[model samples]
Target: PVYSLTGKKIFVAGHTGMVGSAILRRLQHEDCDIITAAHSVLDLTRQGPTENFISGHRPDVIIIAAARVGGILANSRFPADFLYDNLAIGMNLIHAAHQIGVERLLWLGSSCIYPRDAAQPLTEDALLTGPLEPTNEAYAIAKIAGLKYAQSCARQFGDRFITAMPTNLYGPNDNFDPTSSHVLPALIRRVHEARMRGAEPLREFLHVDDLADACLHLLRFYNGIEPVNIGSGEEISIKELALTVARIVGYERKLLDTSRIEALGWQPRIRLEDGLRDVYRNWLEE
Candidate 1:
């Protein structure tokens, strides 16, 4: 049966972060009731509270977007935090949802779940094929566990659980900290700062909005145990991306084979150049 969001009650964990906030925005326009809780109200990393929240509300759909995320430096410095928080949050919520027999669930992971040497335009089947990037190994392991756990639930229990692995994301609410932000946002902040004072970023990039859209698309259309890849299907070097950001911010800057998701009738709407401009304009306002 095809899923529908018409009047479902959905819980979006981690609704404040860039990706979650974008998902919340997209959900608002849908004909569904959305549920959100700040950390102060409900700590997802704790089993007791997370269980209480899920059973009490009993949302029809749950989107596990919460995770302890950080840049490479932070990951290295706080491997324990990255691993524990991510594992706990995902486990607590998924377990709670399964206990209550939530109808549909979606868990979000990152492209890092794939092996470091995975073929370019990474196919989902490349996961666990080789070693991972050492810098953020802990975070990747936690995400892999979450993704597999969700898949296991679908396989073993016939739970309608799905997962997605998104490429590097950026937009409003992105962490622009030099020490912790990802390559694209780091470049945007650095180049914008340099031009403001007047100085001078790799990688596949996807607007958070595109991922958000894919979240909904998957929920409504896809029903598979295997985690799907949500990306722009494009890649660029750090230097060239930086050059583009430098020109755009006055810092010039910069997916994968997203065929699986594209075959599901979904595609990213924002162009890279346009998305960068939007992010830069928002940054200036903030």
Candidate 2:
């Protein structure tokens, strides 16, 4: 049987990243003993150091959320970093965990791991069944490898290591960098910037807290090596999303030539108006 988190040492790698920070926050309510290492304290990509850290810490569970991530332009420009860093961090830590016999692990992958032509509401089995979206292929491949590695470990050692693929996420502490953040955060930032410049904008978005809740739910309720999809189950066109953001930010302008993103299973729980309003309020408070 798999061990529980009560007082168990749980190491959340990439605790400083967006998803990592959210996972850390969600895990806080649990009884697990959380562990974190700053990049200055330990470089995760360095095999020897990571192995030493894992062995020495001997965490009961490992949540591998660390990775090199960015937007399409960033990925296109820095393909090597996305591919190499994610692959190295994933392989090194997972390999170390196996070496140390860590019992339960959760590796977080992204929706981009699905093939380009994947059926709508992409299923777990859609993986590796078709070609990937070229825009984020490198990052997708790295995540795929990580998920596969987790599955392999489970099969080979009867470990409880599992993987989950979450849809586009946004919330507090999100990377708002327009050049490198995901679509939602990027849209939020763009809308905010446009509003600040007296321009109109809009886009679809999901609350980060909701995604965090989903992650925690999966961590507790899901046990198989197969990855499950987490999404809001609602879809809004980008133009609509941008307009909502603009209104929330008090922009008095209108968007032009808005184009919707075509993707399967792209549902969102938060309405564009409400989500943007919340984001706007938070931005003002911040």
Candidate 3:
């Protein structure tokens, strides 16, 4: 479709978060006036504030990447917070964008929007076909609602609002907190720390750059209301991922604890070994 963003006033909602940060970096490379506000400056969860921000800015395009995201444990522990906060963020931002007649809008959704036991290599068609993963259902429901809302705006109002669902992501600005971080960042920190302590560690990861590329790719080429999947199409076990990190970080030992849940139907472009090696080097320098 070759959507040129030159001189476009693009507002990225969650500029501080992992995916959003990556997307922001990519946007900066394009000839666009990228706009962002810190959480302290604007909270999208509140309807009035969100609407006012959108109305005041009247950005040419609104890229909504803001939401309350977490891992399975966090999702399971605080279903209310996960659902309410995410839904509020999506609804308020999307509705406000519409009210202000913003044409080009992109909503970032999650892979968890598909059912937990969805068919391998889950396709966009699998969404809402079966029951969701119980542990993260609240978060998933909220994302699904957001995706549908964007799609509905397209179908009903002829708005250019679209949604893109991305698989597990890891990058420089990723959350390092063990309890709340995704698998990749958690593994990076765990393996790096274990290396410092002469302990074994393992995990899987994809470079944030790759994910950022995919986001920009979809934004430029995809125009349909159907949510497109952004992934590297590669998969690696946490154990294999961790060993590679340890090897790069100068750790030599067997993994302390080995646990393998049923593999999810996701993949990456970057091999875990290479990605972890790069992550180790980056973290070591930091």
Candidate 4:
């Protein structure tokens, strides 16, 4: 019938990070052999080494979930680091994948890749239609390069590559450190610490597991140059979501906080209540 995923040697770059790990989890049961690399073992920022490895192993599929990610403050504080790491990591892996004749690859980038002031429910056309958000300029620019690179590969090298742009994502194994943790996880920790707390503030965020599911299917439906917007068409406000969490955490807690929420630019298929249950369960386990 269609192309077979069975027995494919798949490599998940950034296997140590949140999205990468969940992709790993969803792929575990598949018949294919999934591979990974720790930054300690493979420094993707260096092009020569990346090309050498890809030419050598040449996995049939590569999911590039790796990036030098950060919140606004981190991006603003270290613009150079943000731009360099992201650009290098994406360029190295993607170019290497192309050069070595790897046919199937998925390059992941954030929803913030869109211009800051773009209309709500960001469409694929909005990319590069206007200036990007100031704080995330460095990260966004780097990701933009990767996005363009994959499209070029698709155009120049045949339909061998694709890109996925996901909006704010949250799930198990997320960075929870107050210093670097993103909003959702940050709010979870915040709620854990005190009654008065915060919460997307998203149509629902694509859980890592749900994102993983999408990643797997992407291999089947796409081979084009443009990036596909991965969104669930769902959302929940911050303190409101926190209130939901509070109620879920314990009914005695009051739903006092009020706030507005918006589309994540991307989201997942999972319902908020179901997703939160998973998050709460995983948070406890972590």
Give me the overall lDDT of model 4: 0.75
Give candidate 1's TM-score: 0.93
Tens-place lDDT per residue, model 1, 126-162, is: 8899998898999999998988898889999998998
Give Cα distance to truth, residue 272, candidate 2, Å.
5.5
The true-structure Cα RMSD of candidate 1 reads 2.2
TM-score per candidate: 0.93, 0.85, 0.87, 0.88
Query: What's the CA RMSD for each of the models?
Result: 2.2, 5.8, 6.0, 5.9
Per-residue lDDT of 33-124 in model 3, one digit per residue for the tens?
88999988888889998888889988988888888887777889999999998899989988988888886888887777787777666677
Pairing residues by index, what is the TM-score of model 2? 0.85
Model 3, residue 255: distance off in Å is 24
Model 1 lDDT, full chain set:
0.85
Show the colliding residue pairs in model 2. 121-265, 201-242, 202-241, 202-242, 202-243, 203-241, 203-242, 233-267, 234-267, 234-268
Q: Higher TM-score: candidate 2 or 4?
A: 4
How much is the lDDT of residue 225 in candidate 1? 87
Ten contiguous residues minimizing lDDT sum, candidate 2: 253-262
- Scored against the true structure, residue 66 in model 2 reaches a CA lDDT of 85
* Model 3 spans with C-alpha error above 4 angstroms: 199-205, 253-272
